[PDB]
Design an enzyme around this catalytic site. Structure first.
Site, PDB file in Angstrom:
ATOM      1  N   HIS A  85      14.208   5.144  -7.040  1.00 29.91           N
ATOM      2  CA  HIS A  85      12.910   5.893  -7.517  1.00 29.91           C
ATOM      3  C   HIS A  85      12.917   7.206  -6.748  1.00 29.91           C
ATOM      4  O   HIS A  85      14.028   7.555  -6.077  1.00 29.91           O
ATOM      5  CB  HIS A  85      11.646   5.403  -7.474  1.00 29.91           C
ATOM      6  CG  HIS A  85      11.136   4.830  -5.878  1.00 29.91           C
ATOM      7  ND1 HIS A  85      11.819   3.814  -5.064  1.00 29.91           N
ATOM      8  CD2 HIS A  85      10.201   5.212  -5.203  1.00 29.91           C
ATOM      9  CE1 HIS A  85      11.216   3.727  -3.939  1.00 29.91           C
ATOM     10  NE2 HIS A  85      10.205   4.681  -3.874  1.00 29.91           N
ATOM     11  N   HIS A  87      11.158   8.823  -4.332  1.00 26.34           N
ATOM     12  CA  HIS A  87      10.798   8.937  -2.742  1.00 26.34           C
ATOM     13  C   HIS A  87      11.760   9.376  -1.939  1.00 26.34           C
ATOM     14  O   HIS A  87      13.112   9.145  -2.137  1.00 26.34           O
ATOM     15  CB  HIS A  87      10.043   7.797  -2.225  1.00 26.34           C
ATOM     16  CG  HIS A  87       8.530   7.742  -2.853  1.00 26.34           C
ATOM     17  ND1 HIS A  87       8.009   6.483  -3.203  1.00 26.34           N
ATOM     18  CD2 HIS A  87       7.903   8.472  -3.552  1.00 26.34           C
ATOM     19  CE1 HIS A  87       6.685   6.460  -3.556  1.00 26.34           C
ATOM     20  NE2 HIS A  87       6.630   7.838  -3.898  1.00 26.34           N
ATOM     21  N   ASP A  89      13.118   8.174   0.777  1.00 28.58           N
ATOM     22  CA  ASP A  89      13.914   6.963   1.362  1.00 28.58           C
ATOM     23  C   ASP A  89      15.123   6.432   0.350  1.00 28.58           C
ATOM     24  O   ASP A  89      15.870   5.754   0.719  1.00 28.58           O
ATOM     25  CB  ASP A  89      13.087   5.805   1.630  1.00 28.58           C
ATOM     26  CG  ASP A  89      12.318   5.381   0.762  1.00 28.58           C
ATOM     27  OD1 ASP A  89      11.710   5.676  -0.438  1.00 28.58           O
ATOM     28  OD2 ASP A  89      11.914   3.841   0.967  1.00 28.58           O
ATOM     29  N   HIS A 150       5.538  -0.083  -7.942  1.00 30.32           N
ATOM     30  CA  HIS A 150       5.410   0.622  -6.738  1.00 30.32           C
ATOM     31  C   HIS A 150       5.418   2.043  -7.286  1.00 30.32           C
ATOM     32  O   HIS A 150       4.432   3.068  -6.514  1.00 30.32           O
ATOM     33  CB  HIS A 150       6.546   0.294  -5.679  1.00 30.32           C
ATOM     34  CG  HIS A 150       6.632   1.374  -4.561  1.00 30.32           C
ATOM     35  ND1 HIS A 150       6.094   1.346  -3.529  1.00 30.32           N
ATOM     36  CD2 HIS A 150       7.632   2.672  -4.691  1.00 30.32           C
ATOM     37  CE1 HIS A 150       6.454   2.426  -2.615  1.00 30.32           C
ATOM     38  NE2 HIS A 150       7.239   3.051  -3.475  1.00 30.32           N
ATOM     39  N   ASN A 181       2.254   1.652   1.035  1.00 27.30           N
ATOM     40  CA  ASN A 181       1.854   2.886   0.463  1.00 27.30           C
ATOM     41  C   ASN A 181       1.774   2.741  -1.278  1.00 27.30           C
ATOM     42  O   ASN A 181       2.651   2.412  -2.010  1.00 27.30           O
ATOM     43  CB  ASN A 181       3.049   4.024   0.662  1.00 27.30           C
ATOM     44  CG  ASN A 181       2.791   5.282  -0.237  1.00 27.30           C
ATOM     45  OD1 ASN A 181       1.715   5.674  -0.660  1.00 27.30           O
ATOM     46  ND2 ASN A 181       3.976   6.185  -0.474  1.00 27.30           N
TER      47      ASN A 181
HETATM   48  C1  LIG Z   1       8.326   6.232   3.079  1.00 24.83           C
HETATM   49  C2  LIG Z   1       8.115   5.034   2.004  1.00 24.83           C
HETATM   50  C3  LIG Z   1       8.565   5.280   0.916  1.00 24.83           C
HETATM   51  S1  LIG Z   1       8.685   3.876  -0.238  1.00 24.83           S
HETATM   52  C4  LIG Z   1       6.637   4.776   2.145  1.00 24.83           C
HETATM   53  O1  LIG Z   1       6.021   5.574   1.864  1.00 24.83           O
HETATM   54  N1  LIG Z   1       5.949   3.448   2.336  1.00 24.83           N
HETATM   55  C5  LIG Z   1       6.965   1.912   2.226  1.00 24.83           C
HETATM   56  C6  LIG Z   1       6.890   1.849   3.719  1.00 24.83           C
HETATM   57  C7  LIG Z   1       5.959   1.104   4.442  1.00 24.83           C
HETATM   58  C8  LIG Z   1       4.557   1.053   4.353  1.00 24.83           C
HETATM   59  N2  LIG Z   1       4.069   0.209   5.250  1.00 24.83           N
HETATM   60  C9  LIG Z   1       5.013  -0.431   5.800  1.00 24.83           C
HETATM   61  C10 LIG Z   1       4.941  -1.721   6.580  1.00 24.83           C
HETATM   62  C11 LIG Z   1       6.108  -2.568   6.913  1.00 24.83           C
HETATM   63  C12 LIG Z   1       7.387  -1.817   6.732  1.00 24.83           C
HETATM   64  C13 LIG Z   1       7.405  -0.768   5.855  1.00 24.83           C
HETATM   65  C14 LIG Z   1       6.244   0.002   5.335  1.00 24.83           C
HETATM   66  C15 LIG Z   1       6.227   1.188   1.631  1.00 24.83           C
HETATM   67  O2  LIG Z   1       4.965   1.387   0.934  1.00 24.83           O
HETATM   68  O3  LIG Z   1       6.786   0.182   1.226  1.00 24.83           O
HETATM   69 ZN   LIG Z   2       8.799   4.580  -2.607  1.00 27.18          ZN
HETATM   70 ZN   LIG Z   3      10.635   2.538   0.053  1.00 26.96          ZN
END
Ligand SMILES: C[C@H](CS)C(=O)N[C@@H](Cc1c[nH]c2ccccc12)C(=O)O
Ligand SMILES: [Zn+2]
Ligand SMILES: [Zn+2]
Ligand SMILES: [Zn+2]
Length: 234
Positions: A85, A87, A89, A150, A181
């Site tokens: 996707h 984002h 990462d 997501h 997120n």
């Molecule tokens: C930058 C990434 C791009 S996917 C993002 O923004 N969010 C991720 C990372 C994340 C949020 N809380 C967490 C709690 C534990 C582990 C990972 C996370 C998501 O939501 O899975």
């Molecule tokens: Zn993402």
């Molecule tokens: Zn991610």
């Protein structure tokens, strides 16, 4: 290996590999984001005498470290990469891959969303994935578009020789009991998209989330439970 690596064991800038099955590894990196530090996974799949990469290591420095750790532990060339996707990462570090001679790929949906956001843009386009339920072969993997979850463009990847399902950021690890997120998510459709995954890959033996510890098909029901709890928030 033995224990899966955690945020506490990988300083930002370094990358670890973990062998899942014959010819299949995950890669693990870490990054700072809004004051916290998070781990992140991708995949490596052997493709004859070459390698197929799934996702960057979340940034240019990390992705250069990923290439060096692949050369040390495996020693075969990465010739193609797929981002699952838009984002950072998943696409941050695409320019490092391109400069090293890797052909970078994503769907037209991903390429457009990355450009709007100001993220790096994979060069090549993956056709045949714009409808929910679409699947295409890509060498030693199958690519599947399950529907919006997501993100609206999220893809999953299946390795048939090893029964490994890579869910990316559409699938949550067990330790995550609350949503992360969701700014770019489709909460109304996410459970239906997970059901399409379950129906297409009922034989999967290993399931790899975008962040955190691998498990089995239980991770799909787990993710549904978490998404529905967030939907019902006060
Ligand atoms: C930058 C990434 C791009 S996917 C993002 O923004 N969010 C991720 C990372 C994340 C949020 N809380 C967490 C709690 C534990 C582990 C990972 C996370 C998501 O939501 O899975
Ligand atoms: Zn993402
Ligand atoms: Zn991610
Ligand atoms: Zn659970």
């Amino acid at each position: 290996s033995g224990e899966y690596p955690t945020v506490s064991e990988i300083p930002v800038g370094e990358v670890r590999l973990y062998q899942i099955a014959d010819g299949v590894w995950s890669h693990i990196a870490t990054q700072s984001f809004d004051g916290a530090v998070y781990p992140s996974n991708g995949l490596i799949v052997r493709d004859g005498d070459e390698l197929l990469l799934i996702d960057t290591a979340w940034g240019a420095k990390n992705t250069a470290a990923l290439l060096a750790e692949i050369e040390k532990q495996i020693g075969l060339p990465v010739t193609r990469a797929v981002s699952t996707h838009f984002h950072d990462d998943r696409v941050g570090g695409v320019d490092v891959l391109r400069a090293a001679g890797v052909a970078t790929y994503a769907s037209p949906s991903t390429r457009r969303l990355a450009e709007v956001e100001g993220n790096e843009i994979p060069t090549h386009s993956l056709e045949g994935l714009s409808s929910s339920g679409d699947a295409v072969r890509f060498g030693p993997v199958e690519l599947f578009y399950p529907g919006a979850a997501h993100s609206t463009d999220n893809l999953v990847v299946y390795v048939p020789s090893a029964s490994v399902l890579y869910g990316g950021c559409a699938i949550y690890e067990l330790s995550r009991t609350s949503a992360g997120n969701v700014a770019d998510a489709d909460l109304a459709e996410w459970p239906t998209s997970i059901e399409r995954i379950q129906q297409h890959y009922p034989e999967a033996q290993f399931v790899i989330p975008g962040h955190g510890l691998p498990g089995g098909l239980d991770l799909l029901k787990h993710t549904t439970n978490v998404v529905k709890a967030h939907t019902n928030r006060s």
